[PDB]
Amino acid sequence: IIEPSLKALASKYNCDKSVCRKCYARLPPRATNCRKRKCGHTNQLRPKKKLK
Amino acid sequence: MKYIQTEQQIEVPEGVTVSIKSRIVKVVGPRGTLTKNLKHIDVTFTKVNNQLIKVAVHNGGRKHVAALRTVKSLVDNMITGVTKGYKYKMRYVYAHFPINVNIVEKDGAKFIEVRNFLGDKKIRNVPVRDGVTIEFSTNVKDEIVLSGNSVEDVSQNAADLQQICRVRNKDIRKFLDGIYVSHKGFITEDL
């Protein structure tokens, strides 16, 4: 049991992000392009799947 | 397109003295003196009125002029960093296992020691980088204050504290355990 504010703060670092679709790399939530060169700095991003 | 001349202004308050050689910046302030080597950036500094310094690049490309604004930000961090200071607040997130953290000395090294992280029996040791002070602030449960002159040392050591507490082999989405910076501000309140 964690206080909801603390849970949101931890999720800001663990869950509130995006993923490069081609690369599966973890990227900042509002980033526009993938950071890893293996995916060509692609703009194909998806939101991190949330809990349930 | 090779801009002919690009300029940025760094403001110097009254209580600071800056002496910069070829690229070696020495900022002297109320609580100390900070130094950085900028030999990798190839920029030009020039005084205006001893309270304003101009940093200039002539014939800068798109990448080259990008580092100009970095230098302004990088130096300005010292100017506010030696005057007003940097403090990062950390909270521990733990569902069941409290994170056992304290300060231990081995051979005079001032290591931040972590035990019982999620029931882990590793004793996590993170060095305290030179210049950053470590203190457990009461009136707030499970909170650390990390302070020092240089943003680089305080923030990176703060990250190293976070990085050593990553959860392994588990759903990071639900096992939200860790130590996370809660606030990024200045040591002196509203100065």
Next chain:
Amino acid sequence: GIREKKAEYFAKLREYLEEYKSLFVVGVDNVSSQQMHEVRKELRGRAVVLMGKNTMVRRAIRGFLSDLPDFEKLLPFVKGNVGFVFTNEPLTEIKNVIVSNRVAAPARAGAVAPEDIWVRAVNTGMEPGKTSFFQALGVPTKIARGTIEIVSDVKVVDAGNKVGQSEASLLNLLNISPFTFGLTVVQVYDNGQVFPSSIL
């Protein structure tokens, strides 16, 4: 096409200058559209509220200062979210109608405190778990069978002083509303000379 769009607004302000002899420049900051929505209702027919973005308005006066030069003193007072309540009726009844809307909104986050809060003895009813706010700010209290008890009147914050996040968040679940919400009359333009609303 904004030019013809903007110009039509420019005309509308122009007309109100001549017939309406007064103004109520009001500090309408921190008012909901919903709250301000009813504000139009009571004003039906008697008066009207004109507002625009200061940027065009201040220039727009200058273009009108060509023939009506009596608007110099307005220039400094036109800052922030301010509405020109033009007036063709006795000024006293205007403000009385305006000040009426005084919905006290509980511990609005970010809002600057307009009152010297005297925290009289109140038993919270709050759970022990959330009490972290209480201990952090000192706030001498006693958790009597769960029910925290506020001891005595202490002014944590005063008028015109932003409530700190700690007490600001703390004051929300206590549901005390120091933030009486209302259009704040700062000055009053009267037939060629704006004067502070305080006097009226």
Next chain:
Amino acid sequence: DPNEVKYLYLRAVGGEVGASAALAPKIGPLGLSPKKVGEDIAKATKEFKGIKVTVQLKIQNRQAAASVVPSASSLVITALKEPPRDRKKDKNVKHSGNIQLDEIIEIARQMRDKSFGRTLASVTKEILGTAQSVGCRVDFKNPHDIIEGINAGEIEIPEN
């Protein structure tokens, strides 16, 4: 516990004793018999049979007092003057019956107090505006056209 007064604004199906599966979840918690709410609503909403009309309930410390709020959308439905519909089987019931210009006004006049509009002409536009969603034809004239006509002046709206 005599005194405590509570308002419970909620629409209810008219001219019928309401569905037990929908009133008990909400009304039940406040201590009111399911049978009572239906009879109060049904008789009060008799003329509104088969029409969901907004009905406030004055609730007084384990007591009730229903009152059909004069909802514009609900009341305009009455204006079409349609006896009880067989909605159970009458899928997609389009209440588009014709209505003369004045009947909008009296509904609008009923809404004059609550609506903030400077004129009944503005108020009629709203009641015309709802009738646009309602679909009612107004003396064989499009409600949008009448609203333009309200501005255009051809259809002189009485101020009262």
Next chain:
RNA sequence: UUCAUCUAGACAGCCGGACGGUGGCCAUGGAAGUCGGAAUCCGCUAAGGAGUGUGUAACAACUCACCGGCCGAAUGAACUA
């Protein structure tokens, strides 16, 4: 290259708001803008969509188009090789 926004105040940012008819109409048990079907209104307005989203069984509760202060000078979109 084409089109747009711009000191009659541009983009960005902190946020500087986000109503009423109305819980629009049909059905879903329950859809109150936001599971689906039809159409995409008017009023106060600087402005607010019969609703881009999160979301509740439904509400709710946030949040977003829209612009709702402040700073003050260039910016946005789509294509081209």
